Amino acid sequence: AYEAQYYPGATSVGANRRKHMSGKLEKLREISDEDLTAVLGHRAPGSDYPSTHPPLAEMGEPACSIREAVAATPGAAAGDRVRYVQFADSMYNAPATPYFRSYFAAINFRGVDPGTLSGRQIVEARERDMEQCAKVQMETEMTDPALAGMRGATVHGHSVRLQEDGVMFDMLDRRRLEGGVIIMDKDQVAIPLDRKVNLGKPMSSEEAAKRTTIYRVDNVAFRDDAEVIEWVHRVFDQRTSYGFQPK
Template sequence: MAYELQYYPGATSVAENRRKHMSGKVEKLREISDDDLTLVLGHRAPGSDYPSTHPPLAEMGEPECSVREMVEPTPGAKAGDRVRYVQFVDSMYNGPSVPYFRSYAASINFRGVDPGTLSGRQVVEARERDMEEIAKFQMETEMTCPALASLRGATVHGHSLRLPEDGVMFDMLDRCRREGDVIIMHKDQVGRPIDKKVNLGKPMSAEEAAKRTTIYRVDNVAFRDDAEVIEWVHRVFDQRTTYGFKPEN
């Protein structure tokens, strides 16, 4: 019998959503054009070439190396792209993703990524075109709600702040706004104004966000109600503790 990946314990919708994020089998909800993505990331002008830090690998005359032969370079590495970042901030008010599960999703489903996980933000650094691939994947799928998640290179504390009345996560730098029934972004990740308003799509309704979220909250799916997850955390705790306690050594 083939082994089936388990990913994560738990019997609740939050646990199920976490499994989805980790597996990469998430629903696509919207389209972001390549040029719009480039604009909001703010690393280069739309349509411009990828700046490179070295010639394409094929022109480099790489040394003989079994590891290099075994591991296929990512497209960005092949082309010699520089390393750039995408950073997401997720509201704790039922934002669809959370920092750890963005990192797990990146590590499991994408190659050549360097995820960093903090409380308010989650960053992935990668060769530029590889980074754009994972950025686009997250922005277009149920991993992101344009009102409750946002690209932010700096000032990320909106994640824990009360929601403004329009339901768009607080942003000190006012990068995103609700216009009509969609969310637009008029500044790039680090808050520099951009030439056009980028349509990020419709925000999730409160009900949809509650259904798709990966955060436990007492007013939605309470952590204390997911007994299997707590039991699993206890098991990890037991094992780490007793592993270190080895008086016979």
């Protein structure tokens, strides 16, 4: 078949970007499913998934060829609510960026609704599918507890200068350092959890820079990457020309 190539760029930032887009990410921590549900905050930990409508089998479906050809996700057969997981990533060498979180979610998961902004990146799907996506995003090197985090509101802090502790700014203070490990104690909308979630040891700054997907003159200058600049120029030239005339 056609082997994806996913991106141009020979630097380490290009390598990380291809990692995130292809999802060939490395495990860095463990988060318990009860902890994951608690931090998300869409339902009580270890409780049955609510339903926004009946199951697909219970109410039947119209005669679509697409419905009969496309296999409904496990979270859609049960009629789960369409909940979200939102992340805020630091510009100061966080290991992920909004558009490449979105590329991860779009290439690697079925029936998701990845939305990308500058300061936050939201992923929406049925509850179980979003649980899977949040599990992958939390247990991999894509997410740094110091330089990332779930934020369902007041996502300010992606472009703000880091703290001396080494962690991004959080207005609501969902998680923070505690004994060398970023401990999360509120759901992603600042509704406190009864438990403390231990997300592990934050990566060293050199490590994050070695595995970040953001170009920076400090670490990996975008100006010195001729291949990505050439990609931009080629796409732009084609856009302009074929806007003038499609030929």
